[PDB]
Amino acid sequence: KVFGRCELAAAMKRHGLDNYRGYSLGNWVCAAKFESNFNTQATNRNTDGSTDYGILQINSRWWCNDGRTPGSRNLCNIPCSALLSSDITASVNCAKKIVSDGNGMNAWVAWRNRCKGTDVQAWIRGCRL
């Protein structure tokens, strides 16, 4: 499902992302835009075998089990297949545990490279919440 700008916002807010470890809803929506263009079906290999899963480009290497990443752990404890659904609950709860790895939201590249050091609140601007 290709989410809206504001319905993923209202979706991630309702799941308690707005100011989670102190990152505004504007950080998540911004990240989400450049990870997967608001696509729950987005799937990306890496150079180290492992594959990026869904809205937040969550990493099979450290997080979900996808059945073909040898040196893996799924500390999030989910089949990657879940992070591809129209449902973002597994994608959010997994993200709460990543953002809380004393790394903030830097764990995600397309946020510390395209989002950090910009007006992130423009990304949820003019939306009803």
Side-chain angles (χ1 to χ4, degrees), residues 3-4 7 27 43-44 51 61 65 67 70 86 111 113 123 129:
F3 264 93
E7 84 162 316
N27 283 328
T43 50
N44 257 358
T51 311
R61 195 192 193 171
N65 171 337
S86 176
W111 180 90
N113 256 316
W123 277 97
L129 287 105

Side-chain angles (χ1 to χ4, degrees), residues 52-125:
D52 280 352
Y53 280 84
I55 206 79
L56 269 167
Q57 289 301 281
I58 284 147
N59 190 339
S60 80
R61 195 192 193 171
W62 268 29
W63 287 123
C64 63
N65 171 337
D66 67 313
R68 57 180 302 164
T69 316
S72 270
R73 297 295 176 187
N74 76 322
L75 292 173
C76 261
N77 289 33
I78 45 179
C80 302
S81 293
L83 301 184
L84 306 171
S85 326
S86 176
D87 179 290
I88 65 169
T89 323
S91 308
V92 153
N93 299 334
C94 194
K96 292 198 306 154
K97 171 67 186 183
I98 315 172
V99 78
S100 299
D101 301 338
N103 266 286
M105 273 192 65
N106 282 267
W108 297 272
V109 175
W111 180 90
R112 61 152 313 289
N113 256 316
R114 277 178 273 193
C115 292
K116 195 211 274 194
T118 81
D119 182 75
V120 296
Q121 187 179 353
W123 277 97
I124 60 95
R125 201 176 283 285

